[PDB]
Amino acid sequence: ESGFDYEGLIDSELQKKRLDKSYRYFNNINRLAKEFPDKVTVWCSNDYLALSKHPEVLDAMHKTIDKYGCGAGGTRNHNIPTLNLEAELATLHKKEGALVFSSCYVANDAVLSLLGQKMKDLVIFSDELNHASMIVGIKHANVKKHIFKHNDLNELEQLLQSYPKSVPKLIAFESVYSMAGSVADIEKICDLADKYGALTFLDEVHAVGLYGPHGAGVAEHCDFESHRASGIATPKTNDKGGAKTVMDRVDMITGTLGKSFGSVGGYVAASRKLIDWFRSFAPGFIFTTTLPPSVMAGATAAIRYQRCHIDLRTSQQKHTMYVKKAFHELGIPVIPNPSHIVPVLIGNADLAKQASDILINKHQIYVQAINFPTVARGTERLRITPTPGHTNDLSDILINAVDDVFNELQLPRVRDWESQGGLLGVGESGFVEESNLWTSSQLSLTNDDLNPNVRD
Template sequence: MYGSVKDELATTLQEIRDAGLYKNERELTSPQSAHVTTRRAAALNFCANNYLGLADHPDVVAAAKQALDEWGFGMASVRFICGTQTLHTALERKISDLLGTEATILFSSCFDANGGVFEVLFGAEDAIISDELNHASIIDGVRLSKAKRFRYRNADMTDLRAQLEAATGCRRTVVVTDGVFSMDGSFAPLDEICDLADEFGAMVLVDDSHAVGFIGKGGGGTPELYGVRDRVDIVTGTLGKALGGASGGYVSSHQEIVDLLRQRSRPYLFSNSVAPAVAAGSIAALDMVAGSGDSRAVLRRNTDLFRSLMTEAGFELLPGSHPITPVMFPGEDGALRAAAVAEHMLEHGVYVIAFSHPVVPRGRARIRVQLSAAHSEADVHACVDAFVGARAAGT
């Protein structure tokens, strides 16, 4: 049987390659950092979610090492059987303190958190209204629910109002959005979303994976930035980006919501607990966030410098202020051009990744540059020089 299937899959894979959409994985031979080595070259890393530079920070690594000795390697169980350690409950409290919520529940990843929240809270008599650019994990999580589904144009409050009106009469309604849209680096207008949600009696859920730890005065994310922490009902997020960059996700919310998720959320009930070393390292990272004002300031300066230099050099950037800075390669051949530029840059010591369909819309290929507090000004200049060099080489 597999003979014919193999041929069909091989044809599909070749079509992906021919379209310039094949995603090669480049193997790192070093720890994750602003400076990495690959099997091909040493390189400046401008494509990681390592916003605060904590992925290889000595204090985070030391906490994880100590946890291995004190708490073991893994839990070999789910939370409600025998998979809960003091580390897990301490980490949940730390997240709640940062976000200003009543309670937090850990998941294996934010993908699992988003996959486990909607089915529990929203049934056939309810409505979920989702931004069209929300992360794939939200889309998949919503699909698991029997709730009525509505979608509004990205950050379009007129369309959101129309969808809220269409959902009138449902038992529960929730507006769901990314805090920061990961492919564009743009912010959801949470103050306006909360205003509309209040008007229609809807809840608000925000996936703040690309904001917690470095956005907002205290690193509390987009609800803190917009002054709506007390108006956002549910925050989902990850430990795999600014908060040490390992693994694990969470839902942070009202006590009753978290309690019900512990009883009924399938990814939580049927997945092993977050490893003790990851929990301990994440606690150390959260402790550092509380005093990371200087790092957040460096991150903002690096972001501003990169955007300014790239604009002066004549590259097309999506507007914004987030460390996610998409360098655009529009048109039918954009995917091939972006991939060629990324390859040229790696050969010259700068590691970036090209994004194309289906990760982004057709004709909107890009190289998503991500700045870190661990980058120096010289690193930022080197990245821009590599873009200019790739363009000059005709790639």
């Protein structure tokens, strides 16, 4: 008998994927190689505050390179850029400590894996729409998992209450869910954690930079006024007069440096004891090269800047609300959500892909078509993420273009969805939309309304 047909397996797997060809034989190298390869407004981006191109960030990078070079390997003095970045992140989340990883994928995986490796009897309660990095972390934990329906805290409580209090538990969830912009009720989950003796693990990847007075995320937003008053200080009380804020109550908060903060990397912020434990025992931390000083300095600059520029957030939120209100009046079906994301429901993969195909070619607008398996078949959509940079004149070009594409491809509008009973809140007979996280009051704040200590 001959060997396993490795090539046959790969070929059959690949034949299912839509991969056209870029590799060709080159006489000069006597082998195959990959053959090498405009003015477009980007309306879908993870660079939510446009900080990746901000002067303070680029300046911090250039200057750090002058001092330190490229990689961490060329430095001996943790190094100072690491301490600076960890301190900034701990400050942002008002935690005792923080730890930086290669990516938030690795952060999620390393933390969740370690909790399950050290507590074999841990039970994880996981929101059904958690990011793949959390799913993989929970899998790598090799502990029991119960999935609760998205944001269904009735179902979460039933699952939690079925166990004795003394059983170790973790509730794992995101603050903002990127594909529809839904938002967890963090305070209620913290309440449940207290009652049923659970740790909380919160992924604020799609909130950091964007929520709370200082961009510390939805957890900060839950005690908006306490945090605004205290600045970088731990407030004496929370918004309802109690001792501990929501962000204080969450055990573990993970984020990225790769989105709002205009760089790359991930982190967890937590108690000194949790951070020391991760640092001591997590192989995905221990056994990998530190991020380059320049990248860490850039992230640090972005965090410091965004903390004291609430006008970044108020600007993003106003642009979002401008786009949403316009779409509402035109009957363009946005999945209702209280966040910064504008998901336009199409409900057809071919038509969703064809819409962003026309947006790009005919209107020079980039918008991402989202299909299965990212979302459910039937719920396909265009994802739009307004930024501080999307002024009303750019928004006006986006609204006209999208309206034009809806008419060109004859896509369903809000009232069409209604006649089918609705979908994901769109044209749903008597749906009670959540209020926007950002109130009118909060949106009228300026940088002068921040505590002066946010610059020192």
